Design a protein around this ligand. Structure first.
Ligand SMILES: [Mg+2]
Ligand SMILES: [Mg+2]
Ligand SMILES: [Mg+2]
Ligand SMILES: [Mg+2]
Ligand SMILES: [Mg+2]
Ligand SMILES: [Mg+2]
Ligand SMILES: [Mg+2]
Ligand SMILES: [Mg+2]
Lengths: 96, 63, 99, 92
RNA sequence: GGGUAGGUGGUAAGAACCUCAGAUCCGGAGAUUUCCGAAUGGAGCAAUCCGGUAGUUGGAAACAGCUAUCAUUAAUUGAUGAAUAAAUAGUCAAUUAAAGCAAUACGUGGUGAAGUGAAACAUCUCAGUAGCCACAGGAAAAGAAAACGAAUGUGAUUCCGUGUGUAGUGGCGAGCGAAAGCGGAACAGGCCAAACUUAUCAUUAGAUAGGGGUUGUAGGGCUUGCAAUGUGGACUUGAAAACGAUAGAAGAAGCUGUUGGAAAGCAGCGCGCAAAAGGGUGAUAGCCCCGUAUUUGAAAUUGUUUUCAUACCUAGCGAGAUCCCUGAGUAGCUCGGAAAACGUUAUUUUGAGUGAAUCUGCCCAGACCAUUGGGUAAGCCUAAAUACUAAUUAGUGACCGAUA
RNA sequence: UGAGUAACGCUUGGGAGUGAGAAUCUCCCAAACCGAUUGACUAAGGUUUCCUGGACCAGGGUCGUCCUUCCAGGGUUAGUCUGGACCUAAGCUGAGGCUGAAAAGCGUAGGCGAUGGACAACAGGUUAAUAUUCCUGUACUUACAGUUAGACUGAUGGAGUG
RNA sequence: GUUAAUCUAGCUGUAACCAGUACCGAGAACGAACACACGUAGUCAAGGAGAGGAUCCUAAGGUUAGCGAGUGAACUAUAGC
């Protein structure tokens, strides 16, 4: 399954941008891109302030139910007794 | 071909070693004869048969 | 979207479905020749549907063919026919009048 | 009768110039493997009007895109004009 | 079946759509699969032209749609059938089979040179090579001693090392080069003809189908007994088990600072390891991501091995008795050639001719004879060691890095 | 380097116009050569080279607004024309067959093979591009069915003609 | 064939298949590596004088030979004497 799914909150780890929380819009898995809304605006001088894809390695999930809104890794293991595969943090126990 | 049709004994290839032992290819052709023969249903037929096989047939009384 | 026509009467009415689908497929392509075909996406879907129905037919010992077991055009053909009649009558009349 | 012999109608200025006559010579491009009898039978089955005459021609493939580092070949197609009785017309 | 949330093959944006009632995608199984092409209804200048027959629909009919079928050869079967009475050839019909391609690689067989060296050249050599042709196989070929050979000897074939550059062969020139013996890889030997006998053939069988027998310390058949019900297959069916092959899933560990456009660099303080292979991430990341070690995963197809029952085949030891059988245009021999390391020589092979013996037999131990000893030809088959890699998967390199 | 050297591979003048750019493009007037041909129809051959609109990187032995160059769109219509569905010549192919180490070679019945034979359409008009094809006018030929009148029809073979 | 076919003739009606059809056809679209003075079947083939398709000028029709402008020396070629 995919670590990043279109529609969730996410931040950037490295680059000129830091801590850029935003909603992801599109994923190009064959070339490992992600379109995060509201960040990395390449000023196209058409013959605009659209955004440009950021690599999956830079992106990292962002928890909201934690008191300390930190950034951590993920596990696909946690399978509900009455449901299918899910996401869960490693140094925590909070689904997605 | 120049081979009989009871067996398939065809020509043979060797060398024409003349005096002083020079080499030249030459063909040995089996001796074929058209002597007739009678099958055991009637159907007496004429076929090209080698003389050695003619002797074999003669001594076996196949005519 | 395939098992839903296995349940359906997969022996007779499917050829009527196929001939219909052929009808609007041909009409869609003819409109595509001109403009005014605002939904080109229909062609691929209808071709795919033909493919599915033909597969459902060919799994069975059947063929979509041989299962089949004009208002004013006739008037225009008529007028053409008596026009030809009048021309032939005039021609024969003149030819015999020459003699 | 499969109606896989009526590929497309073509609309060119020559076609229109023939349309503003009175016979209304409709034209189509057809399956190259088909024949005039098949074309007229298909036309009868698809519209209901028995044609008056059918004429055909085929455009041989030619070099297309000229010199463009990837030249290709054009399409071999057969055109079948379909005359009608003088007093009739239909859409397409 | 797996797997999810994006997708509509690349130069590619857009538009218009599909998609979380499970898409796209990946694996297994399928169907569709125009024309040419071995091309095979007939032609033809390949991808075109012209058909016949039997159905079916429309038409009043030619005809037109929709299907099916029609090459040749060989074998089998049936019908028909002349010169001529029968009978044969021939004719027609029905069933089965290849008929082609390539893996520029291996195998066997048929045929088969020159250029070159000999310091020229014909004998030789190159070389039974190259090429052409036929036949295939997953390997093929060979193969169960009428053997090697010198012995109180081994005991199918095949491949490797040695023997060895030896014995030998050679215008005794250039050159060529074993067979034993030994050490190893592998290991399985079976089955017909023949007498004898059963049945059936105008039983003139001289033929067909059964049982019996398959050979060298000769065996088998013939008469009469004894002992056995087994071990084994180069072996049939299923059932069961196991390990796989073709998609996958889980899969640890890090922050700060500085230089800097960017840190993953460097420094400080930590952590994981059955995972310090790799790739990517804005500069060189064990802890950012995909993966990796490790553990697991098959609805369907398929491979291998094991077990069970199960066909088929396979079974030892005596006594009598001039009884019979043991592969004939065959072995030898003559004249020409050839293979064997031999350039014609015992051994093997054959184009022409000639042509035996039958266990007190026949052949052999590099002319030939005798003694001694060895082995039983003129019938068939057989896996393993062996040769190769166009193809699939994984991987490797003191291999190349855009004149390589 | 040879070197900005030989060469640029059968001919003009002018007016007007376009355009940024004019000897070379368009129009106009002359002029000069061809005129048993540089004139018109076509076979084979080429395969879009044809027409319209646009462009002047590259090609044009110079220039270019222009080209047989490049881009975009368009254009060939047959019962009677040329060929096949008809016929054979030289020749090819060839069931059986004969012959040959193998491949193959020869050849019979058959089957192909026009450069020839038989076979029904003419004048005019029309578009930028087609025209015995499209259109108008006039005809002709062959099949097929029905109907009417008459008549006995006659081949896969024979004969004449061809 | 005869309890009829088949043919001839007329009338009514139906049908007539496949491939080529553009353009050039040559001192610029073909064969000559070329916008190369070369080669390429057939057909149409006007007037004057002329036997004539010979020759000269022309008719129908077509072209501006895809580098020019100057000077008019040597020298070269082709003409004229
Ligand atoms: Mg100059
Ligand atoms: Mg100079
Ligand atoms: Mg000079
Ligand atoms: Mg000069
Ligand atoms: Mg010329
Ligand atoms: Mg000519
Ligand atoms: Mg004249
Ligand atoms: Mg002249």
């Amino acid at each position: 399954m995919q670590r990043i799914k279109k529609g969730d909150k996410v931040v950037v780890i490295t680059g000129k941008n830091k801590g850029g929380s935003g909603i992801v819009l599109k994923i190009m898995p064959a070339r490992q891109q992600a379109i995060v809304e509201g960040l990395n605006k390449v000023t196209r001088h058409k013959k605009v302030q659209q955004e440009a894809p950021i690599f999956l390695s830079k992106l990292a999930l962002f928890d909201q139910k934690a008191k300390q809104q930190t950034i951590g890794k993920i596990k696909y293991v946690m399978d509900p007794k009455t449901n299918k595969k899910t996401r869960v943090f490693k140094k925590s126990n909070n689904t997605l | 071909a120049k081979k009989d049709q009871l067996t398939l004994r065809g020509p043979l290839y060797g060398n024409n070693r003349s005096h002083s032992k020079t080499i030249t290819r030459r063909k040995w052709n089996v001796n074929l004869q058209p002597c007739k023969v009678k099958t055991a249903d009637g159907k007496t037929t004429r076929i090209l048969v080698s003389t050695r096989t003619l002797r074999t047939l003669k001594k076996h009384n196949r005519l | 979207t395939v098992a839903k026509e296995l349940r359906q009467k997969s022996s007779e009415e499917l050829v009527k479905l196929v001939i219909k689908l052929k009808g609007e497929l041909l009409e869609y392509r003819f409109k595509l020749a001109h403009g005014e075909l605002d939904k080109p996406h229909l062609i691929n879907q209808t071709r795919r549907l033909l493919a599915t129905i033909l597969t459902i037919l060919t799994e069975r010992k059947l063929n979509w063919q041989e299962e089949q077991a004009n208002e004013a055009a006739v008037n225009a053909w008529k007028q053409h026919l008596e026009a030809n009649k009048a021309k032939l009558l005039k021609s024969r009349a003149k030819r015999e009048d020459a003699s | 009768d499969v109606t896989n012999v009526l590929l497309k109608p073509v609309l060119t200025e020559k076609v229109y110039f023939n349309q503003m006559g009175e016979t209304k010579k409709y034209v189509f491009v057809v399956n190259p493997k088909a024949s005039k009898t098949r074309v007229k039978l298909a036309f009868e089955l698809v519209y209901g009007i028995k044609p008056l005459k059918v004429n055909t021609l085929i455009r041989k493939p030619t070099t297309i895109r000229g010199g463009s580092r990837f030249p290709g070949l054009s399409k071999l197609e057969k055109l079948a004009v379909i005359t009608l009785p003088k007093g009739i017309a239909i859409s397409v």
